[PDB]
Every structure is written in structure tokens, then in C-alpha cells.
Amino acid sequence: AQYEDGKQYTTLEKPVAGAPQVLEFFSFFCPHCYQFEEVLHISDNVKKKLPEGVKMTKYHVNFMGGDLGKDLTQAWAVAMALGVEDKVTVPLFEGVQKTQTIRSASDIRDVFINAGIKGEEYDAAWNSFVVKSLVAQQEKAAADVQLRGVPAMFVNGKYQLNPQGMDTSNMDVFVQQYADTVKYLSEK
Ligand SMILES: CNCc1ccc(Oc2ccccc2)cc1
Numbered sequence: 591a592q593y594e595d596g597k598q599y600t601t602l603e604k605p606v607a608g609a610p611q612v613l614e615f616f617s618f619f620c621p622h623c624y625q626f627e628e629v630l631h632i633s634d635n636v637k638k639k640l641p642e643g644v645k646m647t648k649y650h651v652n653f654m655g656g657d658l659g660k661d662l663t664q665a666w667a668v669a670m671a672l673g674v675e676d677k678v679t680v681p682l683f684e685g686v687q688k689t690q691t692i693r694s695a696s697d698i699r700d701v702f703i704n705a706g707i708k709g710e711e712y713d714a715a716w717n718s719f720v721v722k723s724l725v726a727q728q729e730k731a732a733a734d735v736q737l738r739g740v741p742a743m744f745v746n747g748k749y750q751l752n753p754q755g756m757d758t759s760n761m762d763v764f765v766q767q768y769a770d771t772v773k774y775l776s777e778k
Pocket residue numbers: 622625629630739740741753754758761764
């Protein structure tokens with residue numbers, strides 16, 4: 591009983607059938623999500639412990655940042671459709687929270703242009719119904735679990751990570767505890 595329901599994780603009372611195996615939610619407006627991604631590298635370290643054949647999904651949410659918050663969910667959909675998440679995640683986080691130079695949908699587009707996505711390719715994707723379906727999927731998954739806080743991670747539709755029960759004196763130990771818990775939960 592080294593991992594206890596209620597301590598390092600909680601159990602959903604209404605488990606979600608058909609869910610992705612590892613499902614992470616975030617917002618580019620979310621201060622802890624900035625730490626999680628830019629300083630701790632949570633997603634990457636989880637993936638390096640996950641068993642073979644367990645895939646990881648990451649989705650943006652609407653409920654922070656009003657109008658721009660919703661623009662960012664559609665931009666994340668563009669990032670997923672074009673496969674350029676690894677190129678835009680850092681300048682989007684920094685544009686929103688560090689330099690505070692992202693203030694409109696056009697400013698979001700600038701980050702993609704600077705990362706090398708051609709202007710016509712971004713605009714075609716942005717207006718595509720493939721991207722509209724990806725926005726729909728992101729919203730659906732958040733609604734499925736009554737999501738009200740980010741950062742958040744879910745395993746096999748049944749378990750939600752609880753980082754509040756982890757020591758933060760050392761950032762590397764914390765990340766390792768987090769990844770090892772996702773691994774334990776995926777095996778279960
Ligand atoms: C819902 N928030 C989750 C959470 C909990 C603790 C936490 O502590 C850290 C903050 C910054 C850097 C390292 C750890 C960060 C996020």
C-alpha cells in the first residue's frame with residue numbers, strides 16, 4: 591500500500607469508458623502548467639517510463655483566458671494536425687506568460703510562422719474541419735471528466751494523478767515520483 595487511493599491519485603466515481611490511456615490537460619495561461627512543461631518537463635519524463643504500447647494524449651482547455659483561451663485550443667488543434675507540438679509549445683508558453691506578447695489570434699499565428707510553418711499551411715489548417723473535429727475532441731474529453739483544474743493527468747479513464755501528495759524540495763525527485771505513479775497506474 592505504497593500507492594493509496596486518495597494520496598498519490600484518486601479514483602473517478604464515474605469511470606470513462608473508451609478513454610485514452612494517458613490523458614493530460616493544460617492551458618498556456620496556467621502558471622503551474624508553465625512550470626510542469628518548461629521547468630519540470632513532466633510529459634517527457636512520463637513518456638520515458640510508460641510501458642510499450644501505451645500512448646500519450648495531451649489536450650488544451652478553454653476555461654482560462656477568455657477569448658484568447660479559446661483561440662489557443664484551436665491553435666493546439668492546428669499543432670496536433672500538423673505534428674508540430676515540439677516546435678510551438680515553448681514560444682506559446684513564453685508568449686503568454688513571460689513576455690506577454692500574445693494578445694490576439696494574429697499573435698498566436700506569428701509563433702507558428704516563426705517556428706517555420708508556412709503562412710498558407712497554417713491558415714488552411716486553422717480553417718479546416720479536421721481542426722474543428724480536433725477542437726470537438728478536446729472539449730469532449732474535458733467534459734467527460736468534469737474538468738475544472740489544470741494541470742491534470744488521467745490514466746485509462748479511471749485514475750487521476752494527485753501531485754499534492756509529493757515532496758517538492760527537489761524538483762527531480764518530484765518528477766520521478768510523478769512518472770513512476772503514472773507507470774504504476776497504467777500497469778493496474
Ligand atoms: C494543480 N497543481 C499541481 C501542482 C502541485 C504542486 C506543484 O509544485 C511545484 C511547482 C513548481 C515547480 C515544481 C513543483 C506544481 C503543480
